[PDB]
């Protein structure tokens, strides 16, 4: 899982 | 000649790194400080360099030409792949050859060989990486080419656990052929000779020295007590599955 990853990704 | 797409990347490319990378360093002042007396005295430091530079590659890295149009699974194991090898990269704006060191502006935020040993590397990661920043260095890339170089390295199609490869390939094609266009018109011989090739062939070496990375972090790492000096997203992009 990568939640910090997807968040600093995210639109 | 460069067509509008292509110029439109460029300019798109360079805006994205300028909004990422601060030639001030101003914010270094906010990571815990730098020790330069075993104690691995550097490694709260250059931690906290490591995770904000994840930060701005994550940044920049959104805003390369349709990795919008990625799944975000395929756009986490890119950036999970590459982080590093685009942190050895923007990295070269700071290098200098005239001491070997990167000068982010100040002494104390000064890295030279000794420091990078301090928060637990070794010569068999610090010297490859010395003489890849010279390489690279010696090429005197463009601001141009070394914004393409980073957004190609990111859309690398063979990275572990890519879903959609031919998606990444075409986004990476268009990147390509953007740098090989603009190194034929704008790039004046002689530094332009082989310059594509050479290019490349630095990611080739970003391979090498990521490989080399995570087996010196997955050692670093294993002692809690030196896990505990790092930071949650550091722990994230290089320690998970
Ligand atoms: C903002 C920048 C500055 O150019 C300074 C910078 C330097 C990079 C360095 C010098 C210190 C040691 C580093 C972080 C390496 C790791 C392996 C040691 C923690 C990789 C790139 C190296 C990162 C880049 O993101």
């Keep these: 899982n990568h939640p910090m990853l997807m968040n600093l990704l995210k639109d | 000649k460069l067509s509008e797409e292509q110029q439109h990347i460029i300019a798109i490319l360079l805006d994205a790194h300028h909004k990422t990378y601060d030639p001030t360093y101003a914010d270094f002042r906010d990571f815990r400080p730098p020790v330069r007396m075993s104690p691995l005295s550097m490694l709260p430091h250059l931690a ?18 349709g990795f919008r149009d ?58 490859p990486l010395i003489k890849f920043q010279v390489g690279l260095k010696k090429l005197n890339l463009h601001e141009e080419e070394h914004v393409l170089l980073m957004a190609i390295c990111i859309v690398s199609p063979d990275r572990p656990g890519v879903q959609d490869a031919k998606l990444v390939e075409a986004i990476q094609d268009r990147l390509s052929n953007t740098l090989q266009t603009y190194i034929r018109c704008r790039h004046p011989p002689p530094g332009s000779h082989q310059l594509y090739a050479k290019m490349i062939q630095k990611l080739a070496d970003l391979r090498s020295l990521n490989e080399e990375h995570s087996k010196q972090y997955r050692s670093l790492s294993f002692q809690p007590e030196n896990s505990m000096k790092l930071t949650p997203l550091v722990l994230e992009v290089f320690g998970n599955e």
């Excluded at chain 2, 904000?52 to 805003?63: E, L, N, T, W």
């Excluded at chain 2, 194991?77 to 290098?95: C, D, G, P, T, W």
Aim: charged share 25%.
């Design chain 2, 70 to 127: 990625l799944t975000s699974d395929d756009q986490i194991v890119l950036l999970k792949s590459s982080a590093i090898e685009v942190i050895m990269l923007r990295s070269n704006q700071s290098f200098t050859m005239d001491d070997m060191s990167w000068d982010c502006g100040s002494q104390d935020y000064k890295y030279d060989v000794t420091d990078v040993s301090k928060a637990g590397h070794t010569l068999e990661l610090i010297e």
């Design chain 2, 48 to 65: 906290d360099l490591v995770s904000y530079s994840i930060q701005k590659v994550i940044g920049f890295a959104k805003m390369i030409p």
